[PDB]
Amino acid sequence: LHSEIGRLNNQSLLWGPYRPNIYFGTRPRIGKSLMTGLMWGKIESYTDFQHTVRYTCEQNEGMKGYGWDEYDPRRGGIQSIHDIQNGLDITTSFVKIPGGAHGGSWAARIKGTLNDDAPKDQKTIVVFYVSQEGENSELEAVPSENEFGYEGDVILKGRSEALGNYKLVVTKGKGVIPQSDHDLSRLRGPGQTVVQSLTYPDEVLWQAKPILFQQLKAGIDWLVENKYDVADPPPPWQVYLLANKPGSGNVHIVQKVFEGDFEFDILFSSESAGKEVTSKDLEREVKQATEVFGERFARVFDLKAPFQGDNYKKFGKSMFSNLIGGIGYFYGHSLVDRSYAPEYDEENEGFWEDAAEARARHQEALEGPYELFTSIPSRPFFPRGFLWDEGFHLLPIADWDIDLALEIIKSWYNLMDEDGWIAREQILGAEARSKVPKEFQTQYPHYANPPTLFLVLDNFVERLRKLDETLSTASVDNPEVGLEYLRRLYPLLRRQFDWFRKTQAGDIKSYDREAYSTKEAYRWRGRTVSHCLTSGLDDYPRPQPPHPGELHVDLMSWVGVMVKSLISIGSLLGATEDVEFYTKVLDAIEHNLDDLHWSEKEGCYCDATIDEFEEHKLVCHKGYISLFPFLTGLLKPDSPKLGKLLALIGDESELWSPYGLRSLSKKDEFYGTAENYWRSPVWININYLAIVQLYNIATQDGPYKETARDLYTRLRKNIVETVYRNWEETGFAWEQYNPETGKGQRTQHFTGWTSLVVKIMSGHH
Numbered sequence: 222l223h224s225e226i227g228r229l230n231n232q233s234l235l236w237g238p239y240r241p242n243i244y245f246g247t248r249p250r251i252g253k254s255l256m257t258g259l260m261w262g263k264i265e266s267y268t269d270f271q272h273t274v275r276y277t278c279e280q281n282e283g284m285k286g287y288g289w290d291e292y293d294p295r296r297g298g299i300q301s302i303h304d305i306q307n308g309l310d311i312t313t314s315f316v317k318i319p320g321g322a323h324g325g326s327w328a329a330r331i332k333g334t335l336n337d338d339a340p341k342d343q344k345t346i347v348v349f350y351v352s353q354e355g356e357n358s359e360l361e362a363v364p365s366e367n368e369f370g371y372e373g374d375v376i377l378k379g380r381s382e383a384l385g386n387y388k389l390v391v392t393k394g395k396g397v398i399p400q401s402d403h404d405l406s407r408l409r410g411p412g413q414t415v416v417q418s419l420t421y422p423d424e425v426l427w428q429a430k431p432i433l434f435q436q437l438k439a440g441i442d443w444l445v446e447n448k449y450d451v452a453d454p455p456p457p458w459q460v461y462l463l464a465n466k467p468g469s470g471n472v473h474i475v476q477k478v479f480e481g482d483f484e485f486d487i488l489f490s491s492e493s494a495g496k497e498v499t500s501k502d503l504e505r506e507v508k509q510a511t512e513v514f515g516e517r518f519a520r521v522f523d524l525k526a527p528f529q530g531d532n533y534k535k536f537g538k539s540m541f542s543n544l545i546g547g548i549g550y551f552y553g554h555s556l557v558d559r560s561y562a563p564e565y566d567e568e569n570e571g572f573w574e575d576a577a578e579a580r581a582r583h584q585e586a587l588e589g590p591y592e593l594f595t596s597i598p599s600r601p602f603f604p605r606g607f608l609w610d611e612g613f614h615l616l617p618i619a620d621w622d623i624d625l626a627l628e629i630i631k632s633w634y635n636l637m638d639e640d641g642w643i644a645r646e647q648i649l650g651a652e653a654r655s656k657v658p659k660e661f662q663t664q665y666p667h668y669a670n671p672p673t674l675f676l677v678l679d680n681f682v683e684r685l686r687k688l689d690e691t692l693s694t695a696s697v698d699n700p701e702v703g704l705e706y707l708r709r710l711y712p713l714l715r716r717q718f719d720w721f722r723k724t725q726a727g728d729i730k731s732y733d734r735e736a737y738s739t740k741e742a743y744r745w746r747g748r749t750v751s752h753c754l755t756s757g758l759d760d761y762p763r764p765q766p767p768h769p770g771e772l773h774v775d776l777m778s779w780v781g782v783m784v785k786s787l788i789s790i791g792s793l794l795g796a797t798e799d800v801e802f803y804t805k806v807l808d809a810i811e812h813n814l815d816d817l818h819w820s821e822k823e824g825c826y827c828d829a830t831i832d833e834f835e836e837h838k839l840v841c842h843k844g845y846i847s848l849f850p851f852l853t854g855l856l857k858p859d860s861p862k863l864g865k866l867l868a869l870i871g872d873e874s875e876l877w878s879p880y881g882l883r884s885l886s887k888k889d890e891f892y893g894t895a896e897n898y899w900r901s902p903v904w905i906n907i908n909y910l911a912i913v914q915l916y917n918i919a920t921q922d923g924p925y926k927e928t929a930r931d932l933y934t935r936l937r938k939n940i941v942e943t944v945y946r947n948w949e950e951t952g953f954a955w956e957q958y959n960p961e962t963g964k965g966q967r968t969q970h971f972t973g974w975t976s977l978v979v980k981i982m983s984g985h986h
C-alpha cells in the first residue's frame with residue numbers, strides 16, 4: 222500500500238505549470254519531454270516588439286504586478302498579470318483533468334484585457350511556444366485547409382515513451398484579428414493565426430526568445446529581398462507575422478495577432494484517457510477548482526483575531542497561492558568543484574586567501590544530470606532550489622498538503638552525494654544557469670546550509686503521532702505509509718548529521734578550552750572577512766579576523782535541531798543503538814552551549830574565537846545569532862537564560878521595533894553598516910521562529926509564561942501588519958522590512974519565506 226500511494230502521487234503531480242521562471246508555461250516532472258511557454262507584446266512600430274515582448278519573469282517600473290490568485294498543484298489555479306508597458310491585464314487559468322495512464326490531461330485559458338490607458342485598437346502579438354526533447358518522440362502540426370494560416374484551431378499530434386499518444390490544441394479564440402490591405406497579403410495572407418514547425422538540437426530548445434526572433438528576422442530578410450520597402454511598407458504587425466509553415470519538428474511556434482481584447486485556450490488531451498478535452502471542460506474544472514481551493518483554505522488557514530476580516534483573507538490567499546505556485550521542476554547538470562583542494566579544510570590563519578587561490582584553479586566540472594521538484598524564493602530573482610529556504614517554504618505547504626511536502630523533501634534528499642552533502646543552491650540545466658553569472662554557479666562540497674528541512678519533518682512526526690483530499694493526507698492517515706517513508710529517508714538524515722560533524726567541526730582540544738564535552742563544537746566553513754554565506758545570514762557580524770578557532774552558536778544549535786529529530790524518528794523505527802548515541806550528543810550540546818557560548822556579562826549567547834594570545838574569547842553582537850538556542854527550541858521553559866533572552870527580545874533599544882525583531886541590535890557597533898543586509902532589517906523567517914517559540918512558552922506552565930504571552934501577541938501582530946500594509950500598498954511580499962519605516966526593501970515577489978505570515982495568522986501551533 223506504500224507503493225500504491227507512491228504511484229497515485231506520481232500520477233497526481235506529474236503535470237503542472239512547473240516553470241516558475243516564466244510568466245506562464247507547463248512541463249511535466251520528466252527531464253526530457255514536452256514544454257510550453259507564453260509570450261506577448263504590443264506592436265506599435267517597426268522596432269518596438271523586441272523591447273515589449275514578455276517571457277521570463279522580471280520586476281521593473283513597466284510591470285505593476287503578477288502572481289497566482291489561487292493554486293493547488295494537484296488541480297491548478299488562476300494567475301493575474303498586470304503589465305503597464307503593454308497596457309494589458311492578463312489572466313492565465315490552468316486546470317488538470319485526471320484520467321488515462323500518463324499523468325492526465327490539462328487545459329489553460331489565456332485572457333488579455335486592455336487597461337484604461339491602452340489605445341482601444343492596440344495590436345498585441347501572442348505566441349504559444351511548444352518544444353519536445355527526446356530521441357524517439359514525435360510532434361506534428363496538422364496543416365490548415367486555408368492557404369496562409371488558420372481560420373480555426375491548431376492541432377498538434379505527438380507521441381513519446383513518457384507521455385504515450387497526445388494532442389495539444391490551440392483554439393481559435395475570441396477577439397478582433399486585424400486585416401491588412403497591403404500587397405504583401407497576396408503572399409502572406411491578410412492576417413491569420415500561423416504555425417512554424419522547426420527542429421534544433423535538443424539542448425537549445427529552451428531558448429524560446431532567440432529561436433522566435435531568429436524566425437522573425439528571417440521573415441523581415443525575406444521582405445527586403447522581395448522588394449518590400451519604405452516606399453510603401455506593410456503595417457508593423459504584418460511585418461512581424463511569420464510565414465505559415467506547419468510540419469513536424471521538435472519546436473512549434475503558434476502566433477496570433479489581436480486588436481483589442483482577446484482570449485484563447487490550450488487543450489492537452491492524453492489519448493490514453495477518456496474522450497479529448499474541450500473548452501466546456503475547462504470552464505467547468507476552473508469553477509470546480511475555485512470552490513475546492515476556497516473550502517480547503519478556510520479549514521487549513523483559519524485566520525484568528527485580529528485577522529479574521531476579509532482583507533486579511535485576500536492577503537493570506539495571495540501569500541499562500543504565490544508560495545505554492547512557485548513550485549518548479551528542474552533538470553540538468555550542476556557545476557561542482559570536486560577537487561577537494563586541501564585549502565578548503567580552512568585550518569590556517571588567513572585561510573580565506575588560500576581558498577581564493579584554490580578557487581582560482583577552476584577545477585569545477587558539470588556533473589549530473591539531476592532533477593529537483595521544489596518551491597523557490599522569488600520567481601524574478603531566485604527561480605531555483607535553496608536548501609535552508611525550502612525548510613521555511615514547506616511549513617505552510619505541509620499544512621495544505623503533507624504528501625506534497627514529503628515529495629519535495631524526498632526530491633531534495635535524493636540529491637545528496639555519498640559523503641552526505643547537498644549543495645545549498647540547486648542550479649540545474651542551461652536554462653537555470655542562464656540567469657546566474659558564471660562566477661556564482663559553482664557549488665563547493667564543504668559549504669553547508671541550515672538543515673531547516675528537519676523542522677518540516679518534526680511537524681510531520683507530531684502529526685503522525687496524534688481523491689485529492691485523500692492523497693494530500695495519505696501519509697498521515699495510513700501510518701504504515703508514514704513510517705516506510707521515514708524508514709527510507711532515515712539513513713540519509715543520519716548521513717547528513719554525520720557529514721555536519723565531519724566537515725563543520727570546531728576546534729576544542731587544540732586550545733586552552735574547558736568544556737563538558739570534547740566532541741561538540743561547530744564552525745561554518747566558507748567564511749570570508751566580510752561574509753558567512755553558508756550560515757544563511759550573509760553579513761551578520763562574526764569574529765574578526767575569521768579564524769580556525771571560531772565557534773558559531775547558530776551552527777551548534779542547528780546540530781541540536783537535527784539530533785532532536787533523529788531521536789524522534791529513530792525511536793519510531795526502534796533504532797536503539799542510534800537513539801542512545803543521539804541522547805549523549807544532545808546532552809553534550811546542551812552543556813556545551815552554556816560552557817562555550819554563554820556570556821554571563823552580556824546575558825545572551827555569542828560566537829567564540831581565539832585571542833591574539835591564544836585564549837578563547839566570546840564575541841557578542843546582540844541580534845538574531847544571540848537568541849539561536851531559543852529559536853531552535855533547545856532551552857528548557859524555566860531556564861534563567863531563557864528569561865534573560867526574553868528581556869533581550871522585548872527591549873526596544875535592542876531588537877524590538879514596531880515592525881518586528883531587528884536582525885541586529887541598535888546598540889551594536891555594526892548596526893546599519895556595510896551592505897546592511899542582516900545588520901538591522903526585519904526578516905520574516907527568523908521572526909517566525911521567535912513567534913513559534915514564544916507561543917510554546919506562553920501555552921505552558923512556568924515562570925516566563927505571561928511575559929511570553931505578551932511578546933507572542935504583540936510580535937504576531939507586528940509582523941503580520943508589516944507584511945500586510947506593504948502588500949496593500951505595493952502588491953508584493955518583500956525579502957526584508959525596514960525597522961525604522963516599516964517599508965519592504967530588497968527583492969520583491971519573495972514567496973519565499975515571507976509567506977510564513979499565513980501560518981502566523983492562522984496560529985494554534
Ligand SMILES: NNNc1ccc(NCCOC(=O)NCCN[C@H]2C[C@](O)(CO)[C@@H](O)[C@H](O)[C@H]2O)c([N+](=O)[O-])c1
Pocket residue numbers: 598603607609610646656657658661757758759
Ligand atoms: N547585486 N547582486 N549581487 C550578487 C551577489 C551574489 C550572487 N550569487 C550568489 C547566489 O546567492 C545569492 O543569491 N545572493 C545572496 C543573498 N542571500 C539571501 C537570499 C537567499 O540566498 C535566497 O533566498 C537566502 O537563502 C539567504 O539566506 C539570503 O541572505 C548574485 N547572483 O546574481 O546570483 C548576485
